[PDB]
């Protein structure tokens, strides 16, 4: 099982700096060319920066003397060093197995910017005939992402996350909702599991 | 660096039907060995890998899919695609750094018409209590894309006070869902009596009109 695991995203102002890492398990790390690609909001894929198996050579896109891509193999791991972020530095950054790009990580997200963190509010959304919704509001969070599951991740079917949208305050906010039958709204349990890693808020809401 | 000129940027496939994605290339990538790949991306995904070294598929990927070309000119082909199949396609040359990639093709899935199903949620009390009041419309699974949201206040038609969300189209269903938020003061909320939420569809013989009322 070949696997990239991404962690050492976040927010940050310009000037100041972030370092990603990126570990490989299940295939000899060494061996490997490493690489990593970002996608801005909205945006198509664009190549940041190689290193050799050996670490002995580098290559580099807009980044050339702000990012070091470095490697320790008796880690397994793959690091993206980034001082005078910008603006443009924005976006989801993936690890990807080199010499096709055959494995990815799940991607972790840099934000720069002038704005603070901020952990959203929670609230729920439920009715004031055979189907019925009942959702959660994440409302007043910065930066992305948010995550949300439902009943700890065993309630998928009918789930909708919807795009967050930005609010003229600057703050995000989005709706998570399932729709359910409406026969089981008094015996069964829908709990909405919401994670916003940057400000380290995590919520367990019961909707009624 | 090399140009990888992607077309279309857009296509729409119903099911069982075939779909081809050109990329040519501003350089030729013929180092019989095209520096070549196809890259899928499913919203809220990583890429994966589809096809490398210009013919080449990965592990897991099935027999409709198939790269072709040499030099400047490639395919990807789909001899016939499914649900699960939408989202975005990008080629990349690995020829030399810097990589570059297409703009990306956007597969879209055809369906039949299908009117959403519509819900509002009031703003809760542990909203109301902050001193403000959000309330939310969703539409839900619906086909095609296109829908009208106007909300209502008493009867006025409300407007620049709500923002809108869609999903990604569904990769089982092939639908959409939209939430849509009013964004009130307490104070106001607390004026008026009747919210509703009218909705226009194509599936809907007459926009469907959800409501409640304050107290």
């Known amino acids: 099982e070949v696997q990239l695991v991404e962690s050492g995203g976040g927010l940050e102002q310009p000037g100041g700096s972030l370092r990603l890492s990126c570990a490989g398990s299940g295939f000899t790390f060494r061996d490997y060319a490493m690489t990593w690609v970002r996608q801005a909001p909205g945006k198509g894929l664009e190549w940041v920066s190689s290193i050799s198996g050996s670490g002995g050579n580098t290559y580099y896109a807009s980044v050339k003397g702000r990012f070091t891509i470095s490697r320790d193999n008796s880690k397994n791991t793959l690091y993206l060093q980034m001082n005078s972020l910008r603006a443009e530095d924005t976006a989801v950054y993936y690890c990807?197995?080199?010499?096709?790009?055959?494995?990815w990580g799940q991607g972790t997200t840099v934000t720069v910017s002038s704005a603070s963190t901020k952990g959203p509010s929670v609230f729920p959304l439920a009715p004031c005939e055979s189907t019925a919704a009942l959702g959660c509001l994440v409302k007043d969070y910065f930066p992305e992402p948010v995550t949300v599951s439902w009943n700890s991740g065993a309630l998928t079917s009918g789930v909708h996350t919807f795009p967050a949208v930005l609010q003229s305050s600057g703050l995000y906010s989005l709706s998570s909702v399932v729709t359910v039958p409406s026969s089981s709204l008094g015996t069964k349990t829908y709990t909405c599991n919401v994670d916003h890693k940057p400000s380290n808020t995590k919520v367990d809401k019961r909707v009624e | 660096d090399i140009v990888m000129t992607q077309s279309p940027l857009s296509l729409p496939v119903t099911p069982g039907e075939p779909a081809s994605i050109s990329c040519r290339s501003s350089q030729s990538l013929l180092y019989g060995y095209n520096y070549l790949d196809w890259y899928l991306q499913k919203s809220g995904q990583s890429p994966q890998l589809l096809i490398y070294l210009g013919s080449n598929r990965a592990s897991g990927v099935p027999d409709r899919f198939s790269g072709s070309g040499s030099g400047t000119d490639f395919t990807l082909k789909i001899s016939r695609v499914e649900a699960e199949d939408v989202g975005f396609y990008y080629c990349?040359?690995?020829?030399?750094?810097?990589?570059?990639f297409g703009q990306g093709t956007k597969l879209e899935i055809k369906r039949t018409v299908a009117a959403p199903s519509v819900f509002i949620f009031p703003p809760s009390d542990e909203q109301l209590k902050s001193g403000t009041a959000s309330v939310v419309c969703l539409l839900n699974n619906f086909y095609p894309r296109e829908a009208k949201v106007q909300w209502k206040v008493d009867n006025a038609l409300q407007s620049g006070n709500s923002q809108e969300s869609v999903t990604e189209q569904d990769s089982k269903d092939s639908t959409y869902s939209l939430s849509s938020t009013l964004t009130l003061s307490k104070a106001d909320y607390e004026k008026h009596k009747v919210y509703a939420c009218e909705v226009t569809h194509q599936g809907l013989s007459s926009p469907v009109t959800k409501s409640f009322n304050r107290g």
């Open positions: 990349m040359q690995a020829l030399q750094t810097p990589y570059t």
């Open positions: 990807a197995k080199d010499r096709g790009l055959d494995v």
